[PDB]
């Protein structure tokens, strides 16, 4: 298991996708022209997981950039690493989707999907041992949510044996008060439950709450939010990009983190929380498991952890980490299911991220994620009950039956989480 093919779709997908490529390039010593200027052999050891090696010793991201809106290409090109991407990997349409999921999934988006698939095919045939795909997208809009889910199902049919992983950004009226977002998000969750192996739930409600209440930034912007996103994304991909004790890969993460095929929605966390411009192992382990440090607006103490993976970065005693992790699990034993023995896995990586000597990254499969799904469901129901703006979807070919189906699948997902939260060992 080696190469990952990355795909970024829509405005959100591309904005967070670009920030990811800027942050991991810096960690691996890769400058904006594709050249390596680092000081450690550990930076190039697993570089092939995300970058292709072109002639002239140039590491080029295995990144495919997609969007129905043409103006996104210009904003990606004008960024610090805008010239590192392969010119033929930009697949952009002529007109947007207007926050309409039906346009992305059935009309404009379906007319541009065969073009993106040709590019995926080329990058996949350039892999000796392809492990899977990574997709960055929002669920609130039309392109990343509608076309993104269509792309997932298309790739799932041609590569049914490879892992499908997404970084899915959940809508919040605190960041975007656009009332059709609960429709787009619900329709997409219905697709995600069936067609992905693992999904990192990055919630704009939690990102806004952290920026406003913890960092104390009165008017947070996409930049303040995306700083938390890029730190999480660097954290959760650490074991894919650096040697470590394990030869970690997307399939071993799935097998050990997902006990039930539908419950593959992860709650990531990060410590310490910092803002742009601006610790001991016991503080790090406490902060990492704190409700204010989660990237999904869910209180972990309201549910139970089915599985957890923690990644510690920097210089610290491995015995210290073992003792402190054992201690958190013992003193907080009622927040772990007792029928999955040894459900907490820890890793330590020597290389820390930029500007921090220590860091901890949390990946939890917790039943408390139902709180996020319930929030979206309540909003979808308020809108759907009054049929507000349904013609915008039905006029594009959608059946009203699809809305009820997405609602029913989402409420069933919530019931499934409650089922394992109430389950006992005996």
């Amino acid at each position: 298991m080696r190469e990952i093919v990355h795909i970024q779709a829509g405005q959100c997908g591309n904005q967070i996708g670009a920030k990811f490529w800027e942050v991991i390039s810096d960690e691996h010593g890769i400058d904006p022209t594709g050249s390596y200027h680092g000081d450690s052999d550990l930076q190039l050891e697993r570089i092939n997981v995300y970058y292709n090696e072109a002639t002239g010793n140039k590491y080029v991201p295995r990144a495919i950039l997609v969007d129905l809106e043409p103006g996104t290409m210009d904003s990606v090109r004008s960024g610090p690493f805008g010239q590192i991407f392969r010119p033929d990997n930009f697949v952009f349409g002529q007109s947007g989707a207007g926050n309409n999921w039906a346009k992305g999934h059935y009309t404009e988006g379906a007319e541009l999907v065969d073009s993106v698939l040709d590019v995926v095919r080329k990058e996949s045939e350039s892999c000796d041992c392809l492990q899977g795909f990574q997709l960055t997208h929002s669920l609130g809009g039309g392109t990343g949510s509608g076309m993104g889910t269509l792309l997932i199902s298309k790739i799932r049919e041609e590569y049914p044996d490879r892992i499908m992983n997404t970084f899915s950004v959940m809508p919040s009226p605190k960041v975007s008060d656009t009332v059709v977002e609960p429709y787009n998000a619900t329709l997409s969750v219905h697709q995600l439950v069936e067609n992905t192996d693992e999904t990192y739930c990055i919630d704009n409600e939690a990102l806004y709450d952290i920026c406003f209440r913890t960092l104390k930034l009165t008017t947070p912007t996409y930049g303040d939010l995306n700083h938390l996103v890029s730190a999480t994304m660097s954290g959760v991909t650490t074991c894919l990009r650096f040697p470590g004790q394990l030869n970690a890969d997307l399939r071993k993460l799935a097998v050990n983190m997902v006990p039930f095929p539908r419950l593959h929605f992860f709650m990531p966390g990060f410590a310490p929380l910092t803002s742009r411009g601006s610790l001991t192992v016991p503080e790090l382990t406490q902060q990492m498991f704190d409700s204010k440090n989660m990237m999904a607006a869910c209180d972990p103490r309201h549910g139970r952890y089915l599985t957890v993976a923690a990644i510690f970065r920097g210089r610290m005693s491995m015995k210290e980490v073992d003792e402190q992790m054992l201690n958190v699990q013992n003193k907080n034993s009622s927040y772990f299911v007792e029928w999955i023995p040894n459900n907490v896995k820890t890793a330590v990586c020597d290389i820390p991220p930029r500007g921090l000597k220590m860091s901890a990254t949390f990946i939890g499969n917790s039943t408390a994620i139902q709180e996020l799904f319930k929030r979206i469901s309540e909003q979808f129901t308020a809108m759907f009950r009054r049929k507000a703006f349904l013609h915008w979807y039905t006029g594009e070919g959608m059946d009203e039956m699809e809305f009820t189906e997405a609602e029913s699948n989402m409420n069933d997902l919530v019931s499934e989480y409650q089922q394992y939260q109430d389950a006992t060992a005996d």
Partner: protein, 155 residues
Amino acid sequence: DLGKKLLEAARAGQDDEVRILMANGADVNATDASGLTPLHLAATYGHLEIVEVLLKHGADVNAIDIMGSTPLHLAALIGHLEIVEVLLKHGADVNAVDTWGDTPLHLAAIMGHLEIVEVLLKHGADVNAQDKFGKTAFDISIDNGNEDLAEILQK
């Protein structure tokens, strides 16, 4: 039948067409198959000017469709603050209850329209009104963890 054309013009935001149709006898209180009037449609689609003209020409500010929704329920749900204020100034029942036991406050609360929540409260919104599942607007703020909304509701 000018009533059908007036329903369409109110939804489309055709200001000139609304004025013309009323001048030729169009029923300002016409309804579609679900009981939506031109006022409900203008209020849902954010056409402030059409809401104001219809109110000056005999529109019932408290018209209800088959589900008990008033224009205020739909303005509060979609998030049109300027239309919520105009409706309240023209006598809209701030505490009107639809077939789900929802009041405009429950709808502005669920959808996160905090500025509309503040307006409804200053206009007499009942914080003790329960939906058919027995939930008040404050119960929704507690159940969903919306600290910002809970603070406003406790003002």
